[PDB]
Amino acid sequence: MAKRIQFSTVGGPEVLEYVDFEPEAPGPQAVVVRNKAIGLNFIDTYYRSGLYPAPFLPSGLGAEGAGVVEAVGDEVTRFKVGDRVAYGTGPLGAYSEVHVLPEANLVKLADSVSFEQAAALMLKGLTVQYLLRQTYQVKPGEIILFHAAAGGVGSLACQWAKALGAKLIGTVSSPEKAAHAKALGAWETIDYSHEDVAKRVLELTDGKKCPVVYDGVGQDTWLTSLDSVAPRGLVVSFGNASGPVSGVNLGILAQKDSVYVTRPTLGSYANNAQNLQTMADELFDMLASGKLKVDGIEQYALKDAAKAQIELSARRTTGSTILIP
């Protein structure tokens, strides 16, 4: 028996229950991980709310974590008991003392990386990697727009953008979050709790606007992003914090001067035990070289996962926050 956070029905935070459950016996290519640190991600709230249906109820939650390998399937050779690993993709269940998942979703941690750093970087870091390196290969000097610049993904994006020589214009909801973003490497900040983002962008870019706009909040900033992208530019809708963007008429893309739009998912970029490896190597290489940093991690006891999600959804957090089993 082991403890985990699960829900028997979709809904608000009250739906989460900290209870005993019986971990499954690893498949031939599965790995049993004894979690030491668990990630907190906005998508966790969507599975719990039902925005994204689970395969069955009661359901586990979470897809990011780091810990020690406890058991290995008979066909697994990459990992052995005792190995220190991390993951940011795979089946639900990270919110547990013991998580079982395909070896394809795991990446061995270098002795130099702690479990807290991994649980705070993995998923969000892999996302920034594909957003800035694959979805749209940001080049030095480019002026890009990135919403929620002080959030989990946003904070890493500020740092990565700076590392690339790009000039990231990060939108935030308060002068406090603005200072946070700026300190992490944001070129310019815009407080969209009252400022006109599109206007500010037009002036900051000398009327040329941004070749690419990264939007993880969705609904509330869709028009803003459409008005901030340069002609034939790209609007990357990778999040739905404020809600999903729907009911769009492709005709608006033409109206905004023939722009492009994509709705990427980590699963599509890290769709191999291996495209994951290459991506993870770059992420951890950034950390090891000192271009990315975490130090400054809020910690909640796995049993208090509900409290942690409430703060996240309430927009009362900055950077990464982890759960300790």
Next chain:
Amino acid sequence: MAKRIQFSTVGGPEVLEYVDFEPEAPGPQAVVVRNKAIGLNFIDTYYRSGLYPAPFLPSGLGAEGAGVVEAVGDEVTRFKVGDRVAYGTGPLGAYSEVHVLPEANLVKLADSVSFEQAAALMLKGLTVQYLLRQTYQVKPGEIILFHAAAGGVGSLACQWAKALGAKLIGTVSSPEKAAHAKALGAWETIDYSHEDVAKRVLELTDGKKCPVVYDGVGQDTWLTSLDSVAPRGLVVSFGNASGPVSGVNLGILAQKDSVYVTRPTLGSYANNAQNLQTMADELFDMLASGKLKVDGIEQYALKDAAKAQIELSARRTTGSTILIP
């Protein structure tokens, strides 16, 4: 006084009237063209139907044509009376004996190109140019999907794709249109009057699907295009023959494996008297080199523009068709 085709109200073909009107005096940078050949384009039916509002009623129609310069604005130096020109962008009014437009929308014709070739190539040719060279730089060997392969744009696309060494899979509504497309350079054809396009595409591409899908029919093929694009591939929605594609939830882009979508417009790519020049030079260079050809042009008297539009909308045409003033 001169004759033109105009409409005092939006609606069906019956709305078109062949009447006398008084051409305006060219502005300082405007050019008066004595049309010898006028293009027929699907968008013409949309302005007439009201899908795209005119600035005022009664309104002229058409944006493609070729003829002799009759008058020049005082500030115009690129053109002089007698010059043989062509245009595929600009204000409404091509459906006339005399059309007045900014010099920025004109391109001098080489003595070797007749007015019929220009009126049949200009707009559609410039579109294929930006679709295959700018929207998505098709490379030799790539397998691409292109709907309505026997249409005006489609027919040129079959030829251009072949010239590029690409393998175009063209969808058509009949074995007759299929033969037409094939003869023009289409690699493979699919009769979507009954065949499963997505299925055929999956088998023709060995399960890899198409890096890019060009869709000028819209509504009726949106899902088909989404199911025919490769992961992280691009779906180019440049037309609405079957109707516009609306009410889409960006979430479907993720569902189809993180794809991209754009809704380009000729105006956005040929947005300069000059980006037009470079594009036109390539188009006419293809014609001059024998890679693109027209010969096989249906002709309607400008006064019978309604009959011409009825056939176009009825899907009873192949290649280009022009109106003679």
